Structure 1
Amino acid sequence: VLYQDVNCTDVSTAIHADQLTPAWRIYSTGNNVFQTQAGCLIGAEHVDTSYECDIPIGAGICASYHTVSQKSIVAYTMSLGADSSIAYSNNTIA
């Protein structure tokens, strides 16, 4: 779920107390993640890795479908780019 603009605190209470208008019959909640414009990404684990942005969400937190232990949706920091080792030198020519 990607609830656009909420605190992800009243939505959980509305789901657990049947106060939300979209009421899916077959639906559960096991873990919520909160970032800048999170969306209450129920179903994905906030992994501290850095993978390429596959499904752009917003505020620099994309989603994808990788292996955790196994296949599950994760959240990363878009992996802006691979680090380099190009060091300046006044006597080196490539």
Structure 2
Amino acid sequence: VQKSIVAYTMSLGADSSIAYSNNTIAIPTNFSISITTEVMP
């Protein structure tokens, strides 16, 4: 505010937008590798 408990309206997700084009295309020109950990009983 010093901290306190506050109430808020939750966000649904990041605010993002991409323009539509019938003429152009976007493609990757690089890549990466990553590892995800998953656990199940």
What TM-score bracket applies, with the shorter chain setting the length? 0.3 to 0.5
Q: Give the alignment's TM-score, normalised by structure 1.
A: 0.25
Q: Give the alignment's TM-score, normalised by structure 2.
A: 0.48
Greater CA radius of gyration, 1 or 2?
2
Higher relative contact order (CA 8 A, sep 6+): 1
